[PDB]
Amino acid sequence: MEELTYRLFMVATVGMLAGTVFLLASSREVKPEHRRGVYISALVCGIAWYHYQKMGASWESGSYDTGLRYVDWVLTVPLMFVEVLAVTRKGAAYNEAVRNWGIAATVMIGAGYYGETSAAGSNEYWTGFVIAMATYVWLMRNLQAEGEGLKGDQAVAFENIKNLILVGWIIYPLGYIAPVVGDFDAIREVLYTIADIINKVGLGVLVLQMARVQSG
Numbered sequence: 001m002e003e004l005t006y007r008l009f010m011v012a013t014v015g016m017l018a019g020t021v022f023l024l025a026s027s028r029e030v031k032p033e034h035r036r037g038v039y040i041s042a043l044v045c046g047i048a049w050y051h052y053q054k055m056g057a058s059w060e061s062g063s064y065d066t067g068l069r070y071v072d073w074v075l076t077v078p079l080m081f082v083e084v085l086a087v088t089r090k091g092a093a094y095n096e097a098v099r100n101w102g103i104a105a106t107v108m109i110g111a112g113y114y115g116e117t118s119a120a121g122s123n124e125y126w127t128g129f130v131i132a133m134a135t136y137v138w139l140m141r142n143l144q145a146e147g148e149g150l151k152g153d154q155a156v157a158f159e160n161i162k163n164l165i166l167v168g169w170i171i172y173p174l175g176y177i178a179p180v181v182g183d184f185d186a187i188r189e190v191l192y193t194i195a196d197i198i199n200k201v202g203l204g205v206l207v208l209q210m211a212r213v214q215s216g
């Protein structure tokens with residue numbers, strides 16, 4: 001799966017760029033007070049575009065490791081929560097959640113990286129997973145409660161935003177745990193790549209759809 005993994009990096013790079021340019025162009029189709037999440041979403045795909053180029057160059061040099069993705073994640077995961085809050089909150093409530101959810105997301109990714117950079121199945125490996133998993137659940141529970149105030153088309157549009165994250169992000173912990181049950185190292189990189197594309201481009205598209213409802 002070496003050639004597939006490398007070819008998927010290039011596919012992701014084009015995919016992230018495609019998402020970046022699509023969101024930047026479509027940003028004026030929504031009213032200015034609803035554009036911030038669209039801009040953030042494009043920034044998200046653009047950072048991922050930048051990193052997937054870096055990871056492909058790393059793979060050609062023969063020096064890649066799974067820890068290279070974490071540089072991406074530590075920036076974009078907090079920004080993805082921000083692009084969701086950008087469309088669901090305002091004022092003091094927005095500032096508090098951005099801080100709190102962004103701290104939690106950073107802790108989740110850092111704890112993951114701690115466990116990632118040790119032997120599969122070591123104590124550091126399990127320590128990282130438990131801390132990251134706890135922050136993951138806290139985040140998903142907070143995301144579920146976020147829709148509890150919406151109504152009408154906004155609730156429908158937010159349900160799609162919520163469900164993409166709830167469903168699409170499961171692959172990340174699953175991929176982390178799999179190498180302790182079998183030889184899943186190669187497939188973990190293939191699936192993370194595909195998932196990053198769906199999750200970043202897809203979330204941007206759904207945030208844009210939500211900004212469309214808010215402007216219409």
Ligand SMILES: CCCCCCCC/C=C/CCCCCCCC(=O)OC[C@H](O)CO
Pocket residue numbers: 159160161163164167168171190191194195198
């Ligand atoms: C040998 C290689 C075989 C590879 C085979 C391909 C596997 C692709 C898997 C991706 C994981 C992420 C998928 C996440 C999908 C979530 C979709 C979702 O929940 O969408 C909700 C949204 O509201 C709808 O409008």
Ligand SMILES: *C/C=C(C)/C=C/C=C(C)/C=C/C1=C(C)CCCC1(C)C
Pocket residue numbers: 073076077080108109111112113128129132133136169172173176196199200
């Ligand atoms: C932009 C790409 C995304 C959305 C990546 C998200 C990352 C995670 C949700 C991963 C979290 C982890 C766990 C919940 C458990 C094990 C450690 C991690 C970091 C893989």
